[PDB]
Amino acid sequence: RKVQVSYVIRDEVEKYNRNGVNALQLDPALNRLFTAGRDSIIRIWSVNQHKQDPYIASMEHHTDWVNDIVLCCNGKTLISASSDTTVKVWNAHKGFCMSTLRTHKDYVKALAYAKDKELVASAGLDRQIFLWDVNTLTALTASNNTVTTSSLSGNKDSIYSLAMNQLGTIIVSGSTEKVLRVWDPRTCAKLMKLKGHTDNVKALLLNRDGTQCLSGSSDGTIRLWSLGQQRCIATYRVHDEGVWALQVNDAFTHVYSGGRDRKIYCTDLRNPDIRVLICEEKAPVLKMELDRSADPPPAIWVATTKSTVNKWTLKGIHNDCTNPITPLCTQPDQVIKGGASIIQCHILNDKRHILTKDTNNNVAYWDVLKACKVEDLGKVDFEDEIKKRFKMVYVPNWFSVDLKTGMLTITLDESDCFAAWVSAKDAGFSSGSDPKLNLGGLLLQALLEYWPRTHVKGNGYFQVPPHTPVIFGEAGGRTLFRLLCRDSGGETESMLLNETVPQWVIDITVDKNMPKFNKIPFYLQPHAKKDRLSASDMLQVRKVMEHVYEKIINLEDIAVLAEEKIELLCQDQVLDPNMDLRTVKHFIWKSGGDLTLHYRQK
Amino acid sequence: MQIFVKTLTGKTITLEVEPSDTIENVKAKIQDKEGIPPDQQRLIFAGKQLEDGRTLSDYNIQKESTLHLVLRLRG
Amino acid sequence: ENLLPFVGLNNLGNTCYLNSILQVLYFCPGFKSGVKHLFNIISRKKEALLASYELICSLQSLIISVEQLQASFLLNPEKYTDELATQPRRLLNTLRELNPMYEGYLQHDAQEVLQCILGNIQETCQLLKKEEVKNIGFELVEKLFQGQLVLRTRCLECESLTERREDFQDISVPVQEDMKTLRWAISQFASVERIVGEDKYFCENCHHYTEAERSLLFDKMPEVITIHLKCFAASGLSKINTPLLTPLKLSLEEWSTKPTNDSYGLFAVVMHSGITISSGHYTASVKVTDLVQSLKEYEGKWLLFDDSEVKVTEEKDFLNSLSPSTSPTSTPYLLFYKKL
Numbered sequence A: 001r002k003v004q005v006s007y008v009i010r011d012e013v014e015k016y017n018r019n020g021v022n023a024l025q026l027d028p029a030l031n032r033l034f035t036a037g038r039d040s041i042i043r044i045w046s047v048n049q050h051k052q053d054p055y056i057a058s059m060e061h062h063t064d065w066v067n068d069i070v071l072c073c074n075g076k077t078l079i080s081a082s083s084d085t086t087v088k089v090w091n092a093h094k095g096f097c098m099s100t101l102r103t104h105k106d107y108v109k110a111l112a113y114a115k116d117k118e119l120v121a122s123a124g125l126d127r128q129i130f131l132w133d134v135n136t137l138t139a140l141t142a143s144n145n146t147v148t149t150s151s152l153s154g155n156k157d158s159i160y161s162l163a164m165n166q167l168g169t170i171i172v173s174g175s176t177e178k179v180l181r182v183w184d185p186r187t188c189a190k191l192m193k194l195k196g197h198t199d200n201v202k203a204l205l206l207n208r209d210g211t212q213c214l215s216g217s218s219d220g221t222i223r224l225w226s227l228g229q230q231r232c233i234a235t236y237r238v239h240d241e242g243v244w245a246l247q248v249n250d251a252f253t254h255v256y257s258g259g260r261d262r263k264i265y266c267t268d269l270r271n272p273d274i275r276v277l278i279c280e281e282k283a284p285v286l287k288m289e290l291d292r293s294a295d296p297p298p299a300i301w302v303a304t305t306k307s308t309v310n311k312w313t314l315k316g317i318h319n320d321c322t323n324p325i326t327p328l329c330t331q332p333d334q335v336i337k338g339g340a341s342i343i344q345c346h347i348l349n350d351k352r353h354i355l356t357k358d359t360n361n362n363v364a365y366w367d368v369l370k371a372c373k374v375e376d377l378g379k380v381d382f383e384d385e386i387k388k389r390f391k392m393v394y395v396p397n398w399f400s401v402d403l404k405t406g407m408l409t410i411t412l413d414e415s416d417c418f419a420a421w422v423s424a425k426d427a428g429f430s431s432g433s434d435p436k437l438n439l440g441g442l443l444l445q446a447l448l449e450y451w452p453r454t455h456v457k458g459n460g461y462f463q464v465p466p467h468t469p470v471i472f473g474e475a476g477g478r479t480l481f482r483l484l485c486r487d488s489g490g491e492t493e494s495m496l497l498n499e500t501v502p503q504w505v506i507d508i509t510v511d512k513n514m515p516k517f518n519k520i521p522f523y524l525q526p527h528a529k530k531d532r533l534s535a536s537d538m539l540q541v542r543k544v545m546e547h548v549y550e551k552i553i554n555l556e557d558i559a560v561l562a563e564e565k566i567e568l569l570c571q572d573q574v575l576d577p578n579m580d581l582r583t584v585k586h587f588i589w590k591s592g593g594d595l596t597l598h599y600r601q602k
Numbered sequence B: 001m002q003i004f005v006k007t008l009t010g011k012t013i014t015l016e017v018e019p020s021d022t023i024e025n026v027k028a029k030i031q032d033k034e035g036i037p038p039d040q041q042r043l044i045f046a047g048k049q050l051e052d053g054r055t056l057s058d059y060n061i062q063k064e065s066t067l068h069l070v071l072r073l074r075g
Numbered sequence C: 001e002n003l004l005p006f007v008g009l010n011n012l013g014n015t016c017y018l019n020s021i022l023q024v025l026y027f028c029p030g031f032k033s034g035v036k037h038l039f040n041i042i043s044r045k046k047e048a049l050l051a052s053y054e055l056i057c058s059l060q061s062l063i064i065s066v067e068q069l070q071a072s073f074l075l076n077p078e079k080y081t082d083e084l085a086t087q088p089r090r091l092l093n094t095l096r097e098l099n100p101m102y103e104g105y106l107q108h109d110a111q112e113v114l115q116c117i118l119g120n121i122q123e124t125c126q127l128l129k130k131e132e133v134k135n136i137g138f139e140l141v142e143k144l145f146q147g148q149l150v151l152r153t154r155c156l157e158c159e160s161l162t163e164r165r166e167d168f169q170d171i172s173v174p175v176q177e178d179m180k181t182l183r184w185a186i187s188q189f190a191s192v193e194r195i196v197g198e199d200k201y202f203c204e205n206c207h208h209y210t211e212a213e214r215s216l217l218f219d220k221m222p223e224v225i226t227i228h229l230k231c232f233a234a235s236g237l238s239k240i241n242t243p244l245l246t247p248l249k250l251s252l253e254e255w256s257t258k259p260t261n262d263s264y265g266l267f268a269v270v271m272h273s274g275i276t277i278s279s280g281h282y283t284a285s286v287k288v289t290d291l292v293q294s295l296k297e298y299e300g301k302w303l304l305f306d307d308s309e310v311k312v313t314e315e316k317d318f319l320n321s322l323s324p325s326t327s328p329t330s331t332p333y334l335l336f337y338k339k340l
Ligand SMILES: *NC[C@H](*)CS(C)(=O)=O
Pocket: B074, B075, C011, C013, C014, C015, C016, C017, C107, C108, C279, C280, C281, C282, C307
């Protein structure tokens, strides 16, 4: 539909999560943990205790929340599902993306894995489940090779969970349709429709043989289903709120559950009266991953809406109270630190600088044009800082700000990207001249100055950092192409740009033809000869004064007498000579209609 | 902010607006999403029609406020 | 070949929307008494010594004319022979001043005119209450046509609810999907709806676009429920000339915040006859219950109000005609329910 150009203001290395973690994967062989964050980066961690810094690598190709990740092929390949509607195949040993699957029309919520068949299923809000064979997802590019898709049909509403067994013979989907739908992934045959849940299902598990299933719903119930008898054997009510994460041991006898009420339990499936409160978390539990290095699991990894991933010891699990209150462990054993998410944003009057507040209540000052941070202002009042930096200026909006990733994402759209014409002096630059500059044009020539199609390099005034992600996407979240600013010179990126960059960007950046000046009409009439005038949005009141003095009442430099002879009024307010007409019409013109000015002699 | 409009069939759509947005702009956006010409539209918020030439701030339309879309059955 | 005591209005041009609303609103449980009290206040204020008060004065003149003409018919039946009707010249001029849309003799909407009259009464009444406090009848529209609404939205990611409390004069209701009943349609207006796809809730808790569920519940309940039927669809614009099943008794307990035992009984229907959104004819039907045993002879029977002629219809005949079993030729547009 409509293609937008976005970029992210961020550091070159983002070691720590800048938002909550949506998914977890453990690699027992290498002692390696994977985190899929709402900041759109998959991070790799070491889980050896002696390792002071667990950080290994960062996996950066998504543009929205990474909702699920799956390790497969003995940890060689990882498959990622995101809200950018894409499924990505990675080299988990190195940390680079091999392929992108764009078969989904909406957010991709769920990934399922069958170990023995090397089969992965992907589901999301577009009501579609796609079955993938990981061995044929060794495809580099579409031109080099192409893959064909299998789909499972039947969902009448958005899918939030998926589950296959190891043998790859049963696949179960949970949705806001409230009913569990079961297929045979081998023949794509509809098998069952399990009923009993009253709210959304966000957690599904299957045992090895695919004869039983655990379902955790947002209504607070865990149900154990018999897929052979198509019935719910047992219901467990252990949570006061929705159950969002489920985990089960290998023997499929104890279930580890967590959700919105920030508690994690271990419920015996064959005798639910005995249950142990493992821990009290600080944010709602999103995912849990057991350490499966022992027959009774020794630890558990919890991902919350916070940026900290904690590991809780399970040693001591074996009391007599039906509903014990004391948690088994009061403190985590291993903690992976997190960052701060930009939660609140404010674009200043010049429409070039941003004030942000993060989760630690730190205020930062950002330069959008140069895609950098100007300064950190500490834990000062956000609104007092906004009022402190008020300036009596109007610049039209030319960009949007999204904080979905905990980082500043700036979106440019052809509707308004070129609406900001400013002067070089008023935008910090210089020449002995003061030309009129378009902020969107300058930013676009800065974001893709490494593209050979735009050379004769850059806008000649500023550069964005070379590590800046430049994203070409659609209104709706569907990402077309993402690249770093410095990668635009490669052959692959050059071709993908020749296919992806829209014509509105091409005109300004490649064809070098400049956008349209915007003009406002304004009346000018006596104050105790009337004619309508129009001029640029930017001209200073000095020029209107010069037009009035030298042409209406004109019966040493000529321009000197202009400023001291005529004075200009808008709604009984004397105008600052250096003020532009945008500002007058925005602030001093609170009435309705077209702007009208009045003039009087000193 | 984001406001809601309940369309003719009862379906609810989402509009991204600003407090300084005239009713004509809102009707243009509703035409974009629904195809009804603005001159045929009637918007009702809290039991009041939103007359043109007035902004969304004039009616205290906040985030996730629901507007109702009706037409004129002339007789 | 005899007339009826109950008195209609005159066409006066293309005035059938206004006549329909006026004959509905003259039969509301407490509209006449409230307008008489407000006019008493305005008369006292004038004797103590405006455009806003003109509507109340016009309504009072209309009501006194209607009732005195009906009475004169009762004691002098032969004084009138062909038609028994009056004309709202003053009221139309007043609305024409207070809204330039009604300049001329062109066809207008009935719900819009009802909304204009009610809003103007409410604003005059608030102004008058402010003037008094500067120095029980000041809440007429508020008590009798206004109700409070609760709009719950639930994010499907964090499952965190948000409450919006808004107001409503009318319950605006679809009549067909994108033999249906009024319960189905109120449910489509007020039961849980999921926002998915292009319409996605922006959650300030998630700082993200998420699917959500909205539900509308009724908190405070006006004495008269008016249901505005959306008998029109975007085909370019058409009229849905197939009515839905309308009960005589209605209970809004399903979509209510707190449990209540409050039934609502239908007493007025405003009907549009035509195959086009832009042209048609408006008619009003009301159920007579209270204001000469001749006047009580009509108890429980329905009155059909054409321009100037009045016809008495039995309840069974009216309900059969309104039902979509046969082609009604005049679809319901405005449904009025009063507490019981
Ligand atoms: N559509 C307005 C009413 C028409 S009429 C013929 O009854 O005046």
